[PDB]
Design an enzyme around this catalytic site. Structure first.
Site, PDB file in Angstrom:
ATOM      1  N   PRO A 168       0.869  -1.239   0.057  1.00 35.68           N
ATOM      2  CA  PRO A 168      -0.096   0.058   0.133  1.00 35.68           C
ATOM      3  C   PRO A 168       0.803   1.197   0.072  1.00 35.68           C
ATOM      4  CG  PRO A 168      -0.005  -1.081   2.284  1.00 35.68           C
ATOM      5  CD  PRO A 168       0.745  -2.073   1.308  1.00 35.68           C
ATOM      6  N   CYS A 169       0.041   2.437  -0.548  1.00 37.45           N
ATOM      7  CA  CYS A 169       1.036   3.542  -0.573  1.00 37.45           C
ATOM      8  C   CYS A 169       1.714   4.142   0.349  1.00 37.45           C
ATOM      9  CB  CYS A 169       0.353   4.672  -1.498  1.00 37.45           C
ATOM     10  SG  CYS A 169      -0.271   4.085  -3.149  1.00 37.45           S
ATOM     11  N   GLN A 170       0.847   3.859   1.910  1.00 37.06           N
ATOM     12  CA  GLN A 170       1.375   4.397   2.916  1.00 37.06           C
ATOM     13  C   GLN A 170       2.809   3.929   3.404  1.00 37.06           C
ATOM     14  OE1 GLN A 170      -0.872   2.903   6.270  1.00 37.06           O
ATOM     15  NE2 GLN A 170      -1.346   0.797   5.108  1.00 37.06           N
ATOM     16  N   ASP A 171       3.160   2.907   2.725  1.00 39.88           N
ATOM     17  CA  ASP A 171       4.355   1.958   3.088  1.00 39.88           C
ATOM     18  C   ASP A 171       5.637   2.782   2.590  1.00 39.88           C
ATOM     19  OD1 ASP A 171       2.787   0.167   4.240  1.00 39.88           O
ATOM     20  OD2 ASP A 171       3.628  -1.449   2.986  1.00 39.88           O
ATOM     21  N   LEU A 172       5.364   3.777   1.658  1.00 41.46           N
ATOM     22  CA  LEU A 172       6.593   4.485   1.352  1.00 41.46           C
ATOM     23  C   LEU A 172       6.830   5.566   2.080  1.00 41.46           C
ATOM     24  CD1 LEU A 172       4.902   5.305  -2.389  1.00 41.46           C
ATOM     25  CD2 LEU A 172       6.615   3.801  -1.720  1.00 41.46           C
TER      26      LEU A 172
END
Ligand code: SAM
Ligand code: NA
Length: 376
Positions: free
Chosen positions: A128-132
DNA sequence: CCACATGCGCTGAA
DNA sequence: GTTCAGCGCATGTG
């Protein structure tokens, strides 16, 4: 001359990756093998086993005592109690089979250099994008990065995965995420991989579905030099159009929606080839308020909510796309659906949920068709 | 400011 | 704990 392709599917779901590889294997002279997988969602694991297993005979079993990190909803871990409820059931035998025969390691946090297979040909993944962001990477991507870091130090370069493939949603390339995504690509470079990002729409790969997804195909840089592999320009591919009507299944016993209370309008086609009309005073949620024309393409199938409930206009009335049709909409076969249905373990809504989480199989076929392997 | 397009969603009552 | 009907805006382009 046959080349054994060892595939490791992280966040495998129902195995659209494995399906795509099996679909093209004969034409490439490949034999596809399960190196391993990581999937914790009970209904996905059951369905993966149903679709991909050969000669598996389900029976009542004790759940293996180290199968401890699994999930009934895909989001949260199952409790000690919920594990008890699976223990001594037919369902348990599916989970045991995934562990033993497909080398399912279940939870990415439990994967490390001591159980990550050597000499993987294709490693697939997502995040998921949050993981960046912090909360530097975090979450699932942090684990993937940890795993790559670990194996980089313990494996020979030749034992590292030859190709990596990320799938993700379009918003990965948004204003808020694009720069941090690019730093992940820099990190893949540090790990010894060269990468290309593709934004691909299923509608251009023989499908009747608007579905834009981001793919990052990576090749280990020494293997690039050995094979002479060049990245193909997949974003320019435009195959002949497919319409929703091309996948619909005839039945005399569908349930039709009573829309008599709602005003509507003519159909209109947008630039994306979606042909739809709104229902007035239906809900306050825009994506729930559309009926789709079967002579165009449909919307992205989601796991839940409005875009899991795709209303189509037919001669017989307006109805939802069925679970079988949803499998077909993701380019799985009727026989794949029947195998899942035949488990008698997965509800209609759960079957759509797992379909909505998958990847249209022919996009992956096109990507995998570009891979090069050495005869050695 | 506007019109238009589009969505591997989320969650609290039962 | 599950389940799904009810619910809106984030993120663009032009
Ligand atoms: C969008 S889906 C992938 C579907 C897959 N691409 C397919 O071919 O069907 C994401 C998957 O990641 C799984 N997942 C989430 N957290 C996980 C974890 N900690 N370990 C293993 N799998 C996880 C979910 O259960 C879900 O099936
Ligand atoms: Na039990």
């Amino acid at each position: 001359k046959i080349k054994v392709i060892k595939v490791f599917e992280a966040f495998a779901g129902i195995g659209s990756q494995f399906k795509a590889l099996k679909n093209i294997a004969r034409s490439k002279n490949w034999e596809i093998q399960h190196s391993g997988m990581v999937e914790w969602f009970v209904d996905a694991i059951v369905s993966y086993v149903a679709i991909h297993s050969k000669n598996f005979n389900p029976k009542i079993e004790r759940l293996d005592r180290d199968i401890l990190s699994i999930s009934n909803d895909s989001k949260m871990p199952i409790s000690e109690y919920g594990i008890k409820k699976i223990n001594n059931t037919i369902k348990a035998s599916y989970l045991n089979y995934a562990k033993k025969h497909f080398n399912n390691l279940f939870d990415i946090k439990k994967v490390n250099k001591d159980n990550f297979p050597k000499n993987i040909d294709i490693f697939t993944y997502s995040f998921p994008c949050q993981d960046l962001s912090v909360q530097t990477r975090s979450g699932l991507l942090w684990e993937i990065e940890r795993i790559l870091e670990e194996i980089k130090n313990s494996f020979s370069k030749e034992e590292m995965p030859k190709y990596l493939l990320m799938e993700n949603v379009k918003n990965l390339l948004s204003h808020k995420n694009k720069k941090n995504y690019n730093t992940w690509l820099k990190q893949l470079e540090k790990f010894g991989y060269k990468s290309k990002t593709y934004l691909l729409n299923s509608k251009n790969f023989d499908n009747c579905q608007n579905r834009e997804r981001v793919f990052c195909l990576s090749i280990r840089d020494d293997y690039l030099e050995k094979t002479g592999f060049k990245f193909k320009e997949l974003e320019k591919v435009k195959n002949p159009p497919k319409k929703i009507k091309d996948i619909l299944v005839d039945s005399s016993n569908y349930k039709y929606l009573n829309l008599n209370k709602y005003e509507t309008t003519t159909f209109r086609e947008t630039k994306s080839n979606i042909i739809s009309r709104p229902l007035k005073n239906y809900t306050t949620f825009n994506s729930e308020n559309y009926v789709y024309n079967i002579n165009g393409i449909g919307p992205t199938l989601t796991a839940s909510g409005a875009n899991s409930r795709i209303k189509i206009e037919t001669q017989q009335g307006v109805r939802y796309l069925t679970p079988l049709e949803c499998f077909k909409y993701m380019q799985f076969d009727v026989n794949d659906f029947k195998k899942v249905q035949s488990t008698n373990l997965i509800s209609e809504n759960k079957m759509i949920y797992i379909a909505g989480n998958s990847i249209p199989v022919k996009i992956l076929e096109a990507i995998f068709n570009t891979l090069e392997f050495v005869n050695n």
